Symmetry: C4
Subunit: 450 residues, 4 copies
């Protein structure tokens, strides 16, 4: 065997089947409308159509060999897959899109390729590929815009073909509206035919209108309907363009809107230009160093038993340098990684101060912190990455003259990325295995006596 | 009896009255402006107008026979309904729209059907039908787009009629702007008249402008006003189109935006392509198997005493296979169905692990789980649908060497849809009837000894 | 005083000063550009300009006599108000807009009314009136759309005047782009002048372009700049139109989106058409009876000491029929009115059932409820409006064989609007005055014995 | 060293390098396409190009001398900065944009300035400056709109240059579509050349289309592609304009939407016009006095150890007049400034009333309050700014006949801005230092006895 739709093989086949479906959606109508296209390159159209039909058949086979999830397990029983396929509307659409209507080439002649129009009924495969690509691609907005542009181009191409067909029905050159006479040297070339039809279609759907006005009632009606199709469908698609660009700007726009609200508040309250500059510097840091997004709000949509792995694969850089995690229990790190709230501190920010509520443990992910003196400048100890502080005031200790108080003040030399671990959480998670707690308050007593 | 507006009969009548109202809104102005329309098909217009008026009268009768809610009860007293009708502005509008202005046909002649313009004053019924359909239809966006297209078409039709009337007032063919001379063979046909007027209207409201420029001051003024009506009203309607397409994409766009934020985080943090593929697979599963929507956020707008029934009608498939619910008390299932949080687990995800906080009971809705050994591969027990686990570590038990600990580790073979029932909730809800609890810890002791 | 800007007198004056400001913003540029406008109606323009200037002077006086809030109190000291006025930029703008530039009529002649262009510098007053109207009017969206239309019209009018001025500078009729020769009988009329200039302006700003193309470099540059002004500013304004219509649809669109999510869930889960019809009926009820909006989310932006008054003025209809409120303490009703959560129940919905957690007291605002038998049909007692139930299981009672249990089952005959009062809240709020509690458990014992 | 990108020097250099990048992005294509531009002002183009290249070199030097943050510290080691530069793609782009392609002037002649097209590869610097300006400027929306207008102008300019180049390739005047013959006196001027090309570009990108239709297939194709570029890219940019105006209106629109929901509720519930006027007055006050924004929601994105400084720099005006803060401990004010919830009370609003739950302490930021008698009018004490009340009923006091009760009723004479400090918070924060608490209940006893 089976294909496992989640796999890469299924996605690759989705591409390989979208190619014929897109080809069919673009070219069947073109060949049906522009007769010279069908006739001049008939030897190539036959090859391409037969290859497309072969790929359609192989796609039907793949649909027979693609497993589905019952009880969460991939069904691998062949006949079960055949039944699941045939019971779905997709099998009906596939049989309809693979009906050998090409036999009508013997009746209607080689000049009627619209018999292959049923081949469009595999559009679903194409759309599936798109909805898969949009999910799996690393450039979701580039692909989304390319998809919208493809839809625009297909719509304009189809409307060009429709215009040319209507000109044919009315008669080429019978009036100033229809496509001019084919017998003209310049206006008889297939290139000119298609490109002028596309020009007309673009002017009509984009509602520019710089085309000869209608002459007949059918022409007036078609032009009204087509200008309305233009207005509505092009507003739809080119406003989807707008929404895609909006969601492209979503993060940056939200960040900038927050900054603007802050600046409005500061200018209204006449906040000192010192503090205004400090705030602007904080936000410039958040942007430049790519910290505007908070991983919590993003990863909250992941499963906890997958967001856990995510956090591990991101923070194993530091949670191996820490003494508590991955050293004593070697598994405890998972119990708290999904609750280590990542904070960022500016240079000179006092994370801790003597005589404060010690309700948070900190793990230094990045940055240089200092166990300073209360004078403000004298740096007693420099804590680099992997260090952990703020854990002594969490625990119950014998001989602690300072209970629930910070034993020292910790300031940040530079921008520090820390993991604030709350006291309640450390309490709750160390209950399972105190084999790490013993050396934890080993460190605790050792630092509380000195 | 009375009609009970909530019923299907009332909605069917809403359709049956919207038909004449829509007919009147489309055709009265057309016949008033295009005199040949009124004259040539006068025998049909008379029949249709009289049928419309009869339906208007029957709609007034229905309004006299439609109950309203006082004290939440449907008023069935006839005279009370007559008073409620006559006291509402709707009765005034109905009498105004049913005034026999057709008598003016004897004074103004058969060439003045705008006397029936008062018939437009039942627009409310039409709109009511729409606002009912949008609520009750299964295709809300299809109907909404059809409604907007109907508004566009009606506006363009009315503007075409207005253009033709203005041409008539100025005189057909008196200058290049107005509709050409009626005496022309081609430009005198009612078909050509209406269709060219519609063409002009479309070019003006869509602001394409490929029409002969005005000549007189009245023409310049009307064209300015009409181009502005075009800009404003068509932006309104075709931007409502945009918002409707947006809300069509709302679920998919939110899902894809979450996926994009996740992928941005993973690529920025250089998350391993293993875990990136796992996350993409999780999201592909959520989409393909239609799990992107969380029933909680959707059904939270339902009444609890209706959302309860909803959850029952959805989850009675599994809550009959479970041993606790619908078996001992047979009514307890409602006390917890509105708090069974549905979770989804990937293949191989450890739902439970030995030596963890047993604070959640799980009911396997769909999927195969395994009571494995801690080695990781040896599957002791396979739990299929209807099974419940994680309930032993909830309860107070005699002789439990493992208190508040998982007696075994449960992993998911495939994608498991479970119902996580919190410990607090099971505690709170079993307090009412311990007739099920006794066999609950029957199972508890039986599994805790073996 | 003083005038007290919050008062109605200040708003009326805002209108009376917006009239000259709007007049000045519309007509000064018109008279400056269309010389015939200035000249032909000079006797009227002089009167209107002098009246506008008098009103400007009276507006300056009003600004001297309008109090401001210092320490939250309206300043009534005259000289303090004069200082507050003169210290503001508004005084500078007012003196600039009232500078007697009309004296230049003696130097530049009566054909130069753009000397009155400084009169536009009172635009602020106009805008203030708008921002006041939008706040105080009952039709905020009608006024907002009218304001946007006024901006559109003013912009188009100004661009028409600019086009005519540029034609004058280049010379009327010197090329096909500029306004045609004034000496023409038809193209020399002030009506034709202004209306064709407005036509050109509309075609340019709405970017239709059906105007003679530029000839000179200045004309090309102006047309480029004006088409870009068109694109940008008209997108701005006519997209503000879109956002205004969106916020017009905001409530209805949110309601309908909730209904659509519900229907999607129900159709996906194959919810029985019984329950689907019940849900659709619930939502039809919510809409038809105007219950889609929840007063909590709306009134949460009001002050509690004003939202309290709001809730009182709305619910004194029923909280006078209740026995506890406005009867014993006569003031207790305010302590709980801001926490009476309004619920709606469908016909047949069991609000209470025997043997359930009695943690909510209910006050029947509207609707008929029944104290039924557990059989389901036998109605023991019918509770109409003003009745209160679910209070016995809240209180501590002697001789209650049923503790924390519902003494009877309450069902809703029809759609009941109730006030669910939580047990914790009744406990917390009755602590202040048990003078009502005594008769509360009077009723309690009386019903608990029978 | 180093430059410290957060500093003002780096931003100034960002401007000084954006000037050549913008110059290059505007003029290289212009000179490449309009040959007369390159030739006539070659002496000036050479100077400007060499100055631009010198500034590019100095920008490369700056990039070598700009520190980056490792461990949150600004790297000042020269060679480390050289490595960080050369290891980034920016160094590749800078070397590519500074390659001396001007040497090709000796081969291709002075008429080929597109060899300087590589100079566009420093676009990043320009964009960086923009993203810095948008952050640091006080007019974020003005700058954003200016940036979008710059993008529009650059796109139109580039498309004008492209049109002129295509006309050159096809041949000037070979058909009606291309730019006319250069040999024409009027259509040969560089001014006319560029300005008509810009006119064509504006008509095409804004999709007005009032230009001669294409003649050749290449012209038709280019016009189709360019009209589509117009539609898509101009919708993008001029809808970004819409979103920028939306976020300009965001605060005012949210405020007005809240007011509209309130007014809809009041008119639907038939709220008395007294209370409707009171609510409208409250909202008029909120707007006029600039209180629609709540500093909590804005400043919650700031760091707590920066939002603290913000609140201090804003509220030190009053927290120096208070007796508790900045007087006894002199540091306690920071422990509670981030939890002082700012409330606003209308004139006559009873903040406190005798016999109520004293769970909030109030600090009068602005406004006159009264310790009144319960009669309602007799004002015992007038509390101005700096005063604090509601603190007696917070504390545990000996001899308090009124426990957890308000000792008096406090009403607001005028609009009072207060700081509501919750009881729990005062309890929690006074635990650290009771040196202020002693005089706190000094005041407490002193007022409780009298
Ligand atoms: N007092 C003290 N604290 C230190 C030293 N080195 C690291 N620390 C950390 O500084 C922290 C300050 O807050 P805590 O008292 O909670 O915990 C303290 C220790 O974790 C040291 O040498 N002396
Ligand atoms: N230990 C054990 N647990 C089982 C077995 N079969 C099912 N389970 C479930 O596995 C669950 C693991 O978590 P709990 O200990 O809370 O509850 C346990 C039982 O509900 C079994 O055979 N042995
Ligand atoms: N048992 C009983 N309850 C009644 C009667 N009339 C009204 N009620 C209300 O029905 C309510 C059901 O819930 P509670 O027991 O909390 O409170 C009960 C009473 O408030 C009655 O006649 N008998
Ligand atoms: N009773 C009384 N209260 C006063 C007086 N002056 C100020 N107050 C304040 O009024 C407040 C009312 O609420 P509290 O009793 O909590 O605290 C009271 C005091 O803080 C006074 O003279 N008498
Ligand atoms: Ca056009
Ligand atoms: Ca257009």
């Amino acid at each position: 065997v089976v294909i496992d739709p989640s796999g890469n093989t299924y996605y690759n086949w989705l591409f390989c089947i979208t190619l014929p479906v897109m080809y069919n959606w673009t070219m069947v109508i073109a060949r049906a409308c522009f007769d010279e296209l069908q006739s001049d390159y008939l030897e190539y159209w036959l090859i391409l159509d037969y290859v497309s039909d072969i790929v359609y058949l192989i796609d039907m086979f793949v649909r027979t060999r693609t497993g589905y999830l019952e009880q969460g397990l991939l069904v691998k029983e062949e006949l079960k897959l055949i039944n699941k396929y045939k019971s779905n509307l997709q099998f009906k659409l596939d049989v309809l899109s693979l009906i050998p209507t090409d036999l009508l080439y013997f009746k209607l002649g080689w000049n009627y390729p619209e018999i292959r129009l049923n081949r469009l009924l595999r559009f679903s495969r194409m759309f599936e590929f798109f909805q898969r690509t949009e999910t799996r691609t690393n450039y979701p907005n580039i692909f989304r815009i390319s998809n919208l542009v493809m839809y625009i181009v297909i719509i304009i191409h189809w409307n060009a073909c429709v215009f040319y067909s209507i000109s044919k029905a009315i008669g080429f050159g019978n009036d100033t509206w229809v496509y001019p006479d084919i017998n003209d040297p310049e206006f008889g070339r297939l290139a000119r035919k298609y490109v002028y039809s596309l020009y007309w279609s673009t002017l009509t759907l984009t509602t520019i209108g710089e085309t000869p006005p209608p002459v007949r009632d059918s022409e007036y009606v078609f032009v009204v309907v087509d200008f309305l199709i233009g207005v509505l469908i092009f507003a739809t698609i080119v406003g989807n363009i707008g929404s895609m660009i909006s969601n492209m700007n979503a993060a940056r726009a939200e960040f900038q809107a927050r900054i603007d609200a802050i600046k409005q508040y500061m200018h209204f309250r006449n906040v000192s230009k010192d503090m205004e500059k400090r705030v602007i510097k904080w936000f410039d840091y958040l942007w430049t160093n790519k910290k505007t997004v908070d991983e919590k709000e993003v990863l909250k949509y992941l499963p906890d038993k997958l967001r856990a792995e995510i956090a591990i694969n991101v923070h194993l850089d530091t949670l191996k340098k820490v003494r508590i995690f991955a050293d004593c229990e070697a598994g405890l790190l998972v119990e708290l990684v999904l609750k280590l709230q990542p904070q960022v501190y500016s240079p000179g920010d006092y994370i801790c101060k003597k005589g404060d509520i010690g309700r948070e443990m900190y793990i230094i992910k990045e940055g240089k912190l200092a166990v300073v003196a209360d004078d403000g400048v004298t740096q007693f100890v420099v804590l680099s990455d992997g260090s952990y502080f703020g854990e002594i005031s969490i625990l119950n200790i014998k001989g602690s003259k300072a209970g629930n108080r910070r034993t020292a003040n910790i300031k940040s030399i530079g921008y520090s990325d820390l993991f604030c671990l709350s006291k309640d959480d450390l309490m709750e998670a160390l209950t399972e295995y105190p084999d790490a707690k013993t050396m934890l308050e080993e460190k605790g007593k050792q630092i509380l006596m000195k």
